[PDB]
Amino acid sequence: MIAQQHKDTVAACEAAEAIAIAKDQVWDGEGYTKYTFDDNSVLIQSGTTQYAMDADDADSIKGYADWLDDEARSAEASEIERLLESV
Amino acid sequence: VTDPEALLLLPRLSIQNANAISSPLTWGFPSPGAFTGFVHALQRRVGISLDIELDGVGIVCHRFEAQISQPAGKRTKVFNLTRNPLNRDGSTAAIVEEGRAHLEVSLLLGVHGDGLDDHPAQEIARQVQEQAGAMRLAGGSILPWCNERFPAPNAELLMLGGSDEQRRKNQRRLTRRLLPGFALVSREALLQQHLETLRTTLPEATTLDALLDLCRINFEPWQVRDKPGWLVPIPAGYNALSPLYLPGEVRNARDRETPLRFVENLFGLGEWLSPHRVAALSDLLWYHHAEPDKGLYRWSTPRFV
Amino acid sequence: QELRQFIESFIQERLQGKLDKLQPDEDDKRQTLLATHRREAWLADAARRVGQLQLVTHTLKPIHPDARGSNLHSLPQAPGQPGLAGSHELGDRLVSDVVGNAAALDVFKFLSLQYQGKNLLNWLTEDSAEALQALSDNAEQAREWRQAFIGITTVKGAPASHSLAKQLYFPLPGSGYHLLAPLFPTSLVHHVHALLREARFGDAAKAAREARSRQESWPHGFSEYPNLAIQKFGGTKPQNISQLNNERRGENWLLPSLPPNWQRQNVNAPMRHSSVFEHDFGRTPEVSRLTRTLQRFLAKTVHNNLAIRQRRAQLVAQICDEALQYAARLRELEPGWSATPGCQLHDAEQLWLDPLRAQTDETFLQRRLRGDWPAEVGNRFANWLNRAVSSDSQILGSPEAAQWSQELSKELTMFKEILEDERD
Amino acid sequence: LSTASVLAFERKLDPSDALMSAGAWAQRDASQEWPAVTVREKSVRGTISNRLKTKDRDPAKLDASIQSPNLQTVDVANLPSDADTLKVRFTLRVLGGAGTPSACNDAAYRDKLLQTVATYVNDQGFAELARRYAHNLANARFLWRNRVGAEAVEVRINHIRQGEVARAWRFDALAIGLRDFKADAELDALAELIASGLSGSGHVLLEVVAFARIGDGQEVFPSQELILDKGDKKGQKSKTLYSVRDAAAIHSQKIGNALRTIDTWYPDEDGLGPIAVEPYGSVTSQGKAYRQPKQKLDFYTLLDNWVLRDEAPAVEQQHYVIANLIRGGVFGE
Amino acid sequence: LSTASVLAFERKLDPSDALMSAGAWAQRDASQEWPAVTVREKSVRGTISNRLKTKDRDPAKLDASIQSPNLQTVDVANLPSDADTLKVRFTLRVLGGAGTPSACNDAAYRDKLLQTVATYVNDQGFAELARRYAHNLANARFLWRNRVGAEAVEVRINHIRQGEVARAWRFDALAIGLRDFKADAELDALAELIASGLSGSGHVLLEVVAFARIGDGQEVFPSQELILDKGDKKGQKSKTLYSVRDAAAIHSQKIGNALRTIDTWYPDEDGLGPIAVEPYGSVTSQGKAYRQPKQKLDFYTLLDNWVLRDEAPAVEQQHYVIANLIRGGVFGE
């Protein structure tokens, strides 16, 4: 949760992700990355908006799925049901 | 592109797990650039201690087998892979894919050097195959003895020797050692010929050979086309996409003494031919010719047709 | 302030996209921070994170997934010789796929509207009036924004390859070496995936395929692609490798380039009845292809003497070439070519086939096949070549049948001159 | 001095695929025209026997899931029903020149590396590594599951110069154990042949033949293809087996994995067996990586501290690092 | 301590495909040259005899369906017209080392599992399990439908040390019941041999031959293959039988299913006879799973309680768990 403060600075985001596991990316009509953290947190950045999310949290992953749009329902559905499964 | 004074038949070579990818747009037999680099490697490591000059290479490809599979309802094919060792934490490895194949090729090596008169032919042939039995040919191991490696002796033959009857007789006696073979040549002029034929709509050369390894079903007023030969797409060299750099400029090069440029490979066309249909054998050999100021690095069979 | 109407519309769409369903406080702050740029500094909010992508024309991540090199994205090359396909043949309408951190796709979307009705973003290599047509800010910020917008199809910082990036040595004519690092043509393979989906799928080619199945199809031409291979990139995560879209989920389609004998047949060469009804002919899939080509070449005429006159040299030479290749491919697996019960074409084909001068095939076999030559195998083969196609008033009542008879005599003389050096 | 950013070693001890062919024991002296072992297909109607995820554990779902069973097509290789011996034959070649990298940036690093390797070779030969390689050829590691529960295994090795057999060996792969590298006179002779080959001193071409008496019609285990994309679960084949031409065979990379099993120096226990020589030396069957970089026994650590910084390791870790240089590898930053 | 995420056991009691051959009883002793049973074909037309879904139960639609052709081709295997005895011959290896896994992540888990299995093998033999396995070889469970209605079955088991017979048994598969694990002398000798195989104390290979006297020209039952369905007019093949080089045959796993039908300890009954050893032991013909996980006699529940938490279950359920380890399987999550 230090990363959601320092939002647009991808130097600190890449440091706080380089201590952690690697980087996921989404290609559709819009554009998303994912910064999945060590303690089961993620961080999608998108230009100058974001949405932090820590898993093992059902409301956070549902509003996380609500935060994404409808052409991200074409992809990403087999993963937003995967950590829905993982509980 | 010198004319050969001799020919050397590395007679029968099983290749273990070669590279069946060849380009970003092909998957079959490996690129002939691998064969040109192999004969140049033999020119380096023994071709100067015998005072000779090995340039041409004649690909034969008796028996072929690739490690592929078609996945059960799908019409296309996929490749059989290998397990790599585990990760640093022992989790799993990221899978890149490599096609692997088994070749049984025979190599015809053109010789140009002045040492053809200083050495007996059997000593030249024995040392060449005894060196080549410890090398690799498309990223694939060159296999030793098997159940039927009875034609183990290499043979050397000077094409200039004798009368015209003698030359053509000894040629057709060589062709009895290429018995199920199929030689691979370059047919660039036929690509330009069919492009000049069907260049009404689009004269892009990618569309041309992308509509040649095919069956072309024309309809009623079905008359599918007739195949002139076994035309297959090949990679045919490299074309540059960067200005050339000094030997110290490019980070992470293979050395620091040679200039490096980032290139793109350059697709072509050629077709497999029986060793009876060719006129002589000196017209069959592959050569590397590069124009280094431009970015045109390529290989072909010059003086075939 | 000349023709920035599309820029104002994009700023309004960016303010109404995030601000379509926003909160009061965080939504109001984000809408204000978006709109205050969206007047003029939206180029500034783009050019802050303008270096998270790259208009790659030849990427290097497809070679090894864990290589960190240079994604050089220049135009393909000069043509040079005649027959060389590549990135040079595309020219206009190529897919310069963007590669990088895929969270700043809005910056590439904003920079990707200057060609759809403009001459400042798709044509931003010139037209300084087209560059200043919507900026209206200071000259320093305008110059920095123009530099950030030009730095989206440029280098990554230094010319850098990797140890997992497929470098090679090419030999020069008489001299040393150039080192060659080939890259993956992402643009060319996206073009060829579009062409293969046009040729294999869609609606028109499928209408032609089911009209083929209707048995009385309309005039059209459709494709069929056997022996394609599939090469996947990225493994299970093919979107870290960039713009692998919904036609390429890591889905390279590789054309066949296999050898002529890339499907082997275990040649059980017996002297039995199956080697008796096909012992003098050698029936096979290649033999059936040659017979079908001869039956199609039976209804030919003599008014195309430069093409059909050239077709018979390959269709007639290919028969003798395939017969000699079949004799070679059969003449190694069997150790001793013994006389087989049912060798009707193996009466003289007991030496026309694989003659083994072993202890079994002794000097009496080495003298029967030594002095006796395979002319009867050659004469029987010439009779089989004459009887492959039929015999009518076209083989004797024209010069095209005269051309066929001269070609049959020439092919028989060539096969006999080959077979004379076989036992001799 | 920094490391070379490009390091690449070509492999020595390059084996082929091992074809499998079957016949009767006590006729194995003339086992030259034995028929091969063919891969066939058969059907499998299975059942549900997995661990369930404690939410799908109701009796109705179990009953309704074994209503519709699991139907598969697998590949099987078997002996013929009148032959009890498995002949597995391949050729190993020992190249030599094992300290020279195949791609190196820094010419100073390559000079220091070759000084280090020749200092190793003069201070102690390739005798230890070649006797461990001679063991893993003399027993039958390359018969992976084909070795388990066989009653008589015989290994025949032939050194080959030209079209003639230079020297013959006949080992016994069950007397020669799987764990304790005991010395022998024939193992020392074959090990001296391998160590002559590895030092670039001769042409060494072996021919490794192993016979395993298992029983009439029993199942043999060729290696298995790695296929990722299959069909739509109806017509798919869940198990493909490797075959070079009409003959069930074993891959060359796992015979080379069998030869590489030397490493009795990883810091857990030599009581848990030798493992295969790898960097970060890791076992895929165990799923766990011994010899971590958080310890100091990793190949990168030992090579960098013994080439750059002249912190020469223990003699056993020198054997490990030269075993990696014999293995091959594409190293670097 | 928790379970390993990967466990894998290799099967012991590893049989071969049984091959079928036919001849005359009391030539039964010279059944070495008996010709095979060839899978053949015949044509079949059937009528409408399945249930109707009440919307095809109109009379005119039914009569139109009956006037339709309903042909298809099937495979059959029969005895010849002058042969009334079916011979079924397979082989079997008993390996032993029946608690050691072949792929185990967690090294502490496999240590405590080997302690538990070694405790079992210490205080009890493999005596009850080999007694039950030698029953299912002593009768003719591996003749599945071929035993049903036969008037005389007998079994001949030869233990094989080299190309030579050590000991021969000859049983009477109809006197040895299909239910009662009774007591016998020669059967106890076979149980001692199989228990020495399972314990690791010898080489066990069996030649199991069984003769079923059926009748002239009657039908025998190889195991049936798996074909995919298409809409071919006038009859695609609707039934494929399994065979080897032109000889009808039973799959090896079907014989192996017959041999591990030793489980009389399931909570439902034991007057219903033994069922086969499966995790949550299920019968596919009866469509239900005996030994549900919620009534805690499942293999996974017993193994988790007995390895992770030292709760030794009842003695018979310990026989069940060790029978699952002799079975093999893909364990872990």
CSV table of C-alpha atoms in Angstrom, one decimal, chain B residues 14 16-17 45 63 65 67-74 76-91 95 97 100 102 104 126 129-130 132-136 139-149 152 250-257, chain D residues 5-6 10-11 14-17 32 89 91-93 95 102-107 160 162-163 203 205-207 224-232 235-237 240 242-246 251-253 278 280 282-289 292-293 300 327 333:
chain,number,residue,atom,x,y,z
B,14,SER,CA,22.0,-39.2,-39.8
B,16,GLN,CA,20.0,-36.0,-34.5
B,17,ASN,CA,17.4,-33.4,-33.5
B,45,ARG,CA,38.7,-26.0,-38.6
B,63,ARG,CA,15.1,-39.6,-45.4
B,65,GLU,CA,11.2,-37.2,-40.1
B,67,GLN,CA,8.7,-34.5,-34.3
B,68,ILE,CA,5.2,-33.1,-34.9
B,69,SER,CA,1.6,-34.1,-34.1
B,70,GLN,CA,-1.8,-33.0,-35.3
B,71,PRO,CA,-4.0,-32.4,-32.3
B,72,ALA,CA,-7.1,-34.6,-32.8
B,73,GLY,CA,-9.7,-32.7,-34.8
B,74,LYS,CA,-7.6,-29.7,-35.6
B,76,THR,CA,-3.0,-27.9,-38.5
B,77,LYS,CA,0.0,-29.4,-36.6
B,78,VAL,CA,1.9,-28.7,-33.5
B,79,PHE,CA,5.4,-29.6,-32.3
B,80,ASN,CA,6.6,-32.1,-29.7
B,81,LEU,CA,8.6,-30.4,-27.0
B,82,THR,CA,11.0,-31.3,-24.2
B,83,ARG,CA,11.0,-30.7,-20.5
B,84,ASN,CA,13.6,-28.2,-19.5
B,85,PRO,CA,15.0,-28.3,-16.0
B,86,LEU,CA,13.2,-26.5,-13.2
B,87,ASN,CA,13.5,-22.9,-12.2
B,88,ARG,CA,15.8,-21.4,-9.4
B,89,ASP,CA,13.1,-22.1,-6.8
B,90,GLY,CA,12.2,-25.3,-8.6
B,91,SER,CA,8.8,-24.2,-9.8
B,95,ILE,CA,8.3,-22.7,-22.4
B,97,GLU,CA,9.2,-23.8,-28.6
B,100,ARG,CA,13.2,-30.9,-33.9
B,102,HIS,CA,15.7,-36.2,-38.0
B,104,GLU,CA,19.5,-38.2,-43.4
B,126,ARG,CA,39.0,-39.5,-44.5
B,129,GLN,CA,34.5,-37.0,-42.6
B,130,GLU,CA,36.5,-37.8,-39.5
B,132,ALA,CA,32.7,-33.7,-39.6
B,133,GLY,CA,31.7,-36.6,-37.4
B,134,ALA,CA,32.4,-34.4,-34.4
B,135,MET,CA,30.4,-31.4,-35.5
B,136,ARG,CA,26.7,-30.4,-35.9
B,139,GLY,CA,21.9,-27.4,-34.4
B,140,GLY,CA,21.6,-31.2,-34.6
B,141,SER,CA,24.1,-33.9,-33.7
B,142,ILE,CA,25.6,-35.8,-36.7
B,143,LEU,CA,25.1,-39.4,-35.8
B,144,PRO,CA,27.7,-42.1,-35.8
B,145,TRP,CA,27.3,-45.8,-36.7
B,146,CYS,CA,23.9,-47.4,-36.8
B,147,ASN,CA,22.4,-50.7,-38.0
B,148,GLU,CA,23.4,-50.1,-41.7
B,149,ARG,CA,26.3,-47.6,-41.9
B,152,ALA,CA,31.0,-45.3,-44.4
B,250,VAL,CA,26.4,-3.2,-29.6
B,251,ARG,CA,25.8,-4.4,-26.1
B,252,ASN,CA,25.9,-8.2,-25.5
B,253,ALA,CA,27.3,-9.3,-28.9
B,254,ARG,CA,28.9,-12.7,-29.5
B,255,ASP,CA,32.4,-11.0,-29.5
B,256,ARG,CA,34.0,-7.5,-29.6
B,257,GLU,CA,35.9,-7.8,-32.8
D,5,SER,CA,27.8,-11.1,-20.6
D,6,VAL,CA,27.6,-14.0,-23.1
D,10,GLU,CA,28.7,-26.8,-26.0
D,11,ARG,CA,27.9,-30.3,-24.6
D,14,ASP,CA,26.5,-36.4,-26.8
D,15,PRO,CA,24.2,-39.4,-27.0
D,16,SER,CA,21.6,-40.5,-29.5
D,17,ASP,CA,18.1,-41.8,-29.2
D,32,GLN,CA,21.3,-58.1,-34.4
D,89,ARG,CA,21.0,-49.8,-28.1
D,91,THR,CA,25.8,-44.7,-29.4
D,92,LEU,CA,27.6,-42.2,-27.2
D,93,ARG,CA,30.5,-40.1,-28.4
D,95,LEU,CA,34.1,-35.0,-27.8
D,102,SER,CA,31.4,-21.6,-27.5
D,103,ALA,CA,30.5,-17.9,-27.1
D,104,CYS,CA,32.4,-15.5,-25.0
D,105,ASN,CA,32.4,-11.7,-24.9
D,106,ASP,CA,35.5,-10.9,-22.9
D,107,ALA,CA,38.8,-12.2,-24.2
D,160,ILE,CA,34.7,-48.1,-32.2
D,162,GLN,CA,36.5,-47.5,-37.9
D,163,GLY,CA,34.2,-50.2,-39.2
D,203,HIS,CA,38.6,-40.4,-30.9
D,205,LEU,CA,33.0,-43.5,-29.9
D,206,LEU,CA,31.2,-45.9,-27.7
D,207,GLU,CA,28.3,-48.2,-28.5
D,224,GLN,CA,6.8,-39.7,-23.7
D,225,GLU,CA,6.3,-36.7,-25.9
D,226,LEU,CA,5.5,-33.3,-24.4
D,227,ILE,CA,2.3,-32.2,-26.2
D,228,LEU,CA,0.5,-29.0,-25.1
D,229,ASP,CA,-2.3,-28.7,-27.6
D,230,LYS,CA,-4.6,-31.7,-28.0
D,231,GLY,CA,-8.2,-32.1,-29.4
D,232,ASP,CA,-11.6,-31.4,-27.9
D,235,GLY,CA,-10.9,-37.9,-29.9
D,236,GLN,CA,-7.8,-36.8,-28.0
D,237,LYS,CA,-4.9,-39.1,-27.1
D,240,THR,CA,1.9,-40.4,-26.9
D,242,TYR,CA,8.3,-41.5,-28.6
D,243,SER,CA,9.3,-43.4,-31.7
D,244,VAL,CA,12.0,-43.1,-34.3
D,245,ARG,CA,11.2,-45.1,-37.3
D,246,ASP,CA,8.5,-47.8,-36.4
D,251,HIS,CA,14.9,-39.5,-26.0
D,252,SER,CA,18.5,-38.5,-26.1
D,253,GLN,CA,18.1,-35.7,-23.5
D,278,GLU,CA,22.7,-29.0,-13.2
D,280,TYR,CA,21.1,-24.6,-9.2
D,282,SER,CA,17.5,-29.3,-9.3
D,283,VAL,CA,15.5,-32.5,-9.6
D,284,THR,CA,12.2,-32.4,-11.6
D,285,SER,CA,10.9,-35.5,-9.9
D,286,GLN,CA,11.5,-34.1,-6.5
D,287,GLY,CA,10.1,-30.7,-7.7
D,288,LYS,CA,12.7,-29.1,-5.5
D,289,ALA,CA,16.0,-27.3,-6.2
D,292,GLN,CA,20.5,-22.9,-3.8
D,293,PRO,CA,22.1,-19.5,-4.6
D,300,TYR,CA,27.6,-19.4,-10.9
D,327,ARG,CA,27.2,-30.7,-19.5
D,333,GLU,CA,24.1,-12.1,-16.9
